[PDB]
Amino acid sequence: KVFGRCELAAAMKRHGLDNYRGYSLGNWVCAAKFESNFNTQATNRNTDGSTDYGILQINSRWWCNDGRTPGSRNLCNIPCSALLSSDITASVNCAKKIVSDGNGMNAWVAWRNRCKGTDVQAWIRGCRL
Ligand SMILES: [Cl-]
């Protein structure tokens, strides 16, 4: 599923990401846009061999198990395939452990380089929550 921007925004608030650890909703939506283009099915290989899964591009290295990632942790205790669902619950649930870790939303490279310190409010403008 490729979500609409406002539709993902709604789904994300429902799942309690709005101002989750201080990260306003526009940040999560901004991260999603550049990570996956709002596409739940999106997969990208990393240079280290690992794979990023889903609308928030969660990494097989540490967070999910895809069967083919070296010595790889499965810290959200889920198969990476779960993260490609049209239902975003597992992605969201996993993103909360990630962001609660230590480095906050910097664990998403695309957020650090493209969203951080920008007007992320614009990402939820005109969206009925
Ligand atoms: Cl933080």
From Swiss-Prot:
GO annotation, cellular component aspect: cytoplasm; endoplasmic reticulum; extracellular space
PROSITE patterns: GLYCOSYL_HYDROL_F22_1 (PS00128), GLYCOSYL_HYDROL_F22_2 (PS51348)
EC number: 3.2.1.17
Reactions catalysed: Hydrolysis of (1->4)-beta-linkages between N-acetylmuramic acid and N-acetyl-D-glucosamine residues in a peptidoglycan and between N-acetyl-D-glucosamine residues in chitodextrins
Tissues where this protein is expressed: In the egg white and polymorphonuclear leukocytes.
Pfam family, one: Lys
Disulphide connectivity of cysteines: 6-127, 30-115, 64-80, 76-94
GO biological process, one term: defense response to bacterium
Catalytic residues in the record: 35, 52
Other remarks on this protein: Lysozyme C is capable of both hydrolysis and transglycosylation; it also shows a slight esterase activity. It acts rapidly on both peptide-substituted and unsubstituted peptidoglycan, and slowly on chitin oligosaccharides.
Quaternary state and interactors: Monomer.
Protein name, as recorded: Lysozyme C
Organism, as annotated: Gallus gallus (Chicken)
Record gene name: LYZ
